[PDB]
Design a protein around this ligand. Structure first.
Ligand code: 9J6
Ligand code: CA
Ligand code: ZN
Ligand code: ZN
Ligand code: ZN
Length: 263
C-alpha cells in the first residue's frame, strides 16, 4: 500500500500483470532530436496518469551497429508499468561500452535537466536506472561505476572486454542468452555476474536456447523480470519481491543465480 511506500505505483501485481504486454498506465511519447548534446537522441515513453505521483526513469541503450528501434518494444511495455523509459540512439553506431555508459548518463541528465515540462513534471530525478543490450549492456555496467547513485542496472546479453565489476554498488540484473556467439555467456555475462560483490543485490537469468538478439524482440520472460527488478529497486516496491525471490523457475530459464533475499 501507498502508506508504507510513497513510490508504489499501480495495482498489486500478479503473474498476469507482470507478463502483460501493457500495464496499468497509458503511455505517451516525446521524441528527442539526435542533436541533443551528449548522446544521439531517442524516444521518451512516459505514463500519462499523474494521480499517483512521479516516476523513476530508465535509460535504455542499444548494441553495436544497432539503433533505438532494436529496443523499442521496451518503451511502452515497461513505461506502462509506471516508469519513464528513454530508448536512446548513440553518437555513432560504432561506439564502445565506455562511450555507451557516458551516453546513458547523458540521457538521464537530459531527462532531469532539459526535458519538456510534460516529462519533467512526471519525473522523480532521485530514482534513475540504466539498461542496455550487448555493448549497451556493457555500457550499463560502465554507467554504474561512473554513477554509483543509480538505483538499478540491467545489462542484457552484455558485451565488454572489461571482465571485472567488483566495484559496482548498484543492484544489477544480468540477462544472458545461452547460445550467444557474439557475447558468449562463458566469458561475458557469467564472469560479469560472478565479479559483482556477493553482498550486492544481484541476479543472473540465462535464457535457454536464446541467441544474442533475443532481447530485441518481445520476450515475456525478459519483460516480467525487467519490470520486477525496476519495481523492486527504482521504486523500493517490495510487492515485487515475490517474483524475484526465491529464484524464478520459468521453463524459458536455463539457470538463475541470485543473492536473494534482498534486505
Ligand atoms: C565488429 C566489431 O566488434 C563487435 O562485433 C563486438 C561485439 C558487439 C556486441 C554487440 O553490441 O552486439
Ligand atoms: Ca547528439
Ligand atoms: Zn505498500
Ligand atoms: Zn573492471
Ligand atoms: Zn538450454
Amino acid at each position: 500500500g501507498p502508506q508504507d511506500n510513497p513510490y508504489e505505483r499501480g495495482p498489486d501485481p500478479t503473474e498476469d500483470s507482470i507478463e502483460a504486454i501493457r500495464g496499468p498506465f497509458s503511455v505517451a511519447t516525446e521524441r528527442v532530436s539526435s542533436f541533443a548534446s551528449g548522446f544521439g537522441g531517442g524516444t521518451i515513453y512516459y505514463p500519462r496518469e499523474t494521480d499517483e505521483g512521479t516516476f523513476g526513469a530508465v535509460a535504455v541503450a542499444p548494441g553495436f551497429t544497432a539503433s533505438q528501434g532494436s529496443m523499442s518494444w521496451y518503451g511502452e511495455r515497461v513505461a506502462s508499468q509506471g516508469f519513464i523509459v528513454f530508448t536512446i540512439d548513440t553518437n555513432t553506431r560504432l561506439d564502445q561500452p565506455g562511450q555507451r555508459g557516458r551516453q546513458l548518463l547523458a540521457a538521464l541528465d537530459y531527462l532531469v535537466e532539459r526535458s519538456d515540462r510534460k516529462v519533467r513534471e512526471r519525473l522523480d530525478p532521485n530514482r534513475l536506472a540504466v539498461m542496455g543490450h550487448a555493448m549497451g549492456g556493457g555500457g550499463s555496467l560502465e554507467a554504474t561505476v561512473m554513477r554509483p547513485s543509480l538505483k538499478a542496472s540491467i545489462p542484457l546479453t552484455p558485451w565488454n572486454l572489461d571482465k571485472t565489476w567488483g566495484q559496482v554498488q548498484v543492484p544489477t540484473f544480468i540477462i544472458g542468452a545461452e547460445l550467444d556467439t557474439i557475447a558468449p555467456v562463458s566469458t561475458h555475462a557469467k564472469p560479469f555476474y560472478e565479479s559483482l560483490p556477493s553482498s550486492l543485490p544481484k541476479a543472473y537469468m540465462e535464457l535457454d536456447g536464446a541467441t544474442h538478439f533475443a532481447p530485441n524482440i518481445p520476450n515475456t520472460t525478459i519483460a516480467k523480470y525487467v519490470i520486477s527488478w525496476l519495481k523492486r529497486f527504482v521504486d523500493e516496491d517490495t510487492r515485487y519481491s515475490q517474483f524475484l525471490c526465491p529464484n524464478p523457475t520459468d521453463r524459458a530459464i536455463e539457470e538463475y543465480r541470485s543473492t536473494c533475499p534482498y534486505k
